[PDB]
């Protein structure tokens, strides 16, 4: 997706609880650096629910696509308060931003 459009979405809907940079601080939610390829609930220093901790999934384009569409459906019991992003293209652009931002 479009990394540029993705940044705006993140800035507006995720930044209140998440940081994406290396060394990024944990807020209400965990820092997301190193997200791609990482299993659920593995950001060091953050205390996840057992639901997030044991989902047993690796974050990547396909998983994030499903998660971001409806978080609680994908991870029942999650303490992440977010209803989801319905438009497929918006999830794609956001996901493209995450791919970049969390690995640089």
């Amino acid at each position, epitope marked *: 997706g479009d990394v540029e459009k993705g940044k705006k979405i993140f800035v507006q809907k995720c930044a209140q609880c998440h940081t994406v940079e290396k060394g990024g601080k944990h807020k209400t939610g965990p820092n997301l650096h190193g997200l791609f390829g990482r299993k659920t609930g593995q950001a060091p220093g953050f205390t996840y629910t057992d639901a997030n901790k044991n989902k047993g999934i690796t974050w990547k384009e396909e998983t994030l696509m499903e998660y971001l569409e409806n978080p609680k459906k994908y991870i029942p019991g999650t303490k992440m308060i977010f209803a989801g992003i319905k438009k497929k293209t918006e999830r794609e652009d956001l996901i493209a931003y995450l791919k*970049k931002a969390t*690995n640089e």
Partner: antibody
Amino acid sequence: EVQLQQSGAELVKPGASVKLSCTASGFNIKDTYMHWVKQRPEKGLEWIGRIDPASGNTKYDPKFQDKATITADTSSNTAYLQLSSLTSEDTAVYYCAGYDYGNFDYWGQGTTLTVSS
Amino acid sequence: DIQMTQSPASLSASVGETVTITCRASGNIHNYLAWYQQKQGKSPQLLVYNAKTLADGVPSRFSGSGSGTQYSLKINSLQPEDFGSYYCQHFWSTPWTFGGGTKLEIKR
């Protein structure tokens, strides 16, 4: 103990098709992406594409879109590569591999395909 | 589609020497660059992923660095078992292309 066992060597006639398999064990193919890579004798690696068995979603290098078809039977822990309208240009070793963005990265032993009349 | 330009195609070196292989992507790949090693007649093996993280079982004489479109694989004090071929591959976007490869051979 992760293992990726590929099918045996194949000898097929030009114009025919062939299907190679890659059976995993020690892991589920749904946990990562299953790739197919071609390598002609003494030449470099060519990424044909991959499949995300969990979502059935496939990706290909355009150069192979009309030649190869990657599938996966998540109900047998096996991935497959189907090559159509074979020519001498398809004679090569084909590797399957399971991996995505991290340290989990395992390759099969490869399958040698010879296309000849 | 992003293409990887790997150089040199051939590299002559001696045991004990330090050597460097480079990969240039046709577009920014944001550190999603892996390096694979392929010993003569064997299957490729992951050596480095995410541009700088050594893979499991990989000796510390290996190291990778880079960012954007430029990346490098450095081998310090080459060992006899290091001679073979090396390939980079980006994971940024489909297709995940491999560089042309580098064949590390013995100088004489």
